[PDB]
Amino acid sequence: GSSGSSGQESVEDSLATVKVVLIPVGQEIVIPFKVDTILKYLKDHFSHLLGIPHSVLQIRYSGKILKNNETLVQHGVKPQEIVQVEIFSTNPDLYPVRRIDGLTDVSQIITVSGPSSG
Numbered sequence: 001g002s003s004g005s006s007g008q009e010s011v012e013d014s015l016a017t018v019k020v021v022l023i024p025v026g027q028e029i030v031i032p033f034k035v036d037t038i039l040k041y042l043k044d045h046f047s048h049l050l051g052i053p054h055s056v057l058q059i060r061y062s063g064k065i066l067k068n069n070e071t072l073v074q075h076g077v078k079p080q081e082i083v084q085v086e087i088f089s090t091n092p093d094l095y096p097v098r099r100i101d102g103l104t105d106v107s108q109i110i111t112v113s114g115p116s117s118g
Contacts, residue, residue, distance in 0.1 A: 001044070014079040016072070018042075023088035024097045028107045033072075035079050040068035046087065049102075052095035060086045 014036060020029045033042050039059055047054045059066045061075065061083075077083060089097050 001048070003048070012080065016077065016079055017082040018072075019082070019084045021084065021086050022097060022099070023086050024092060025099055027099055029100060029105060030107070035072045035077050035081075038069055038071050039066050043068065046100070049100055050098055052089065052097070056091040056095045057087070057089045057097070060088070 012032075014034055015032045016035050018031065018033045020031060021027070022029070031042070040054070043054050043057060043059060047057055050057075054068070064075070066075065066085075072083075087097065089095050
């Protein structure tokens with residue numbers, strides 16, 4: 001499609017932190033997204049980049065299936081907040097999900113294991 005046109009605005013009053021995790025890949029990607037802007041906008045992006053259509057690619061949140069015309073504020077998301085969403089494709093055999101190219105981000109994590117038996 002078309003990607004370029006963009007006005008002027010440099011603020012973070014509404015923009016919230018939306019973490020993205022690849023289901024098939026398992027990688028982690030963080031990118032700022034508007035709470036008033038539909039999800040599609042964010043989706044269509046990964047689609048083109050990956051080279052696969054959105055007709056097969058979908059999103060998941062709170063064990064629910066978010067729609068394109070759907071919005072974060074519609075599900076219950078406030079501005080300047082942090083969340084976590086997962087991405088995956090219904091038809092992996094036809095349109096599999098690959099890693100993004102262009103930038104190199106990094107993340108961290110930690111977990112506690114179980115103690116001894118006795």
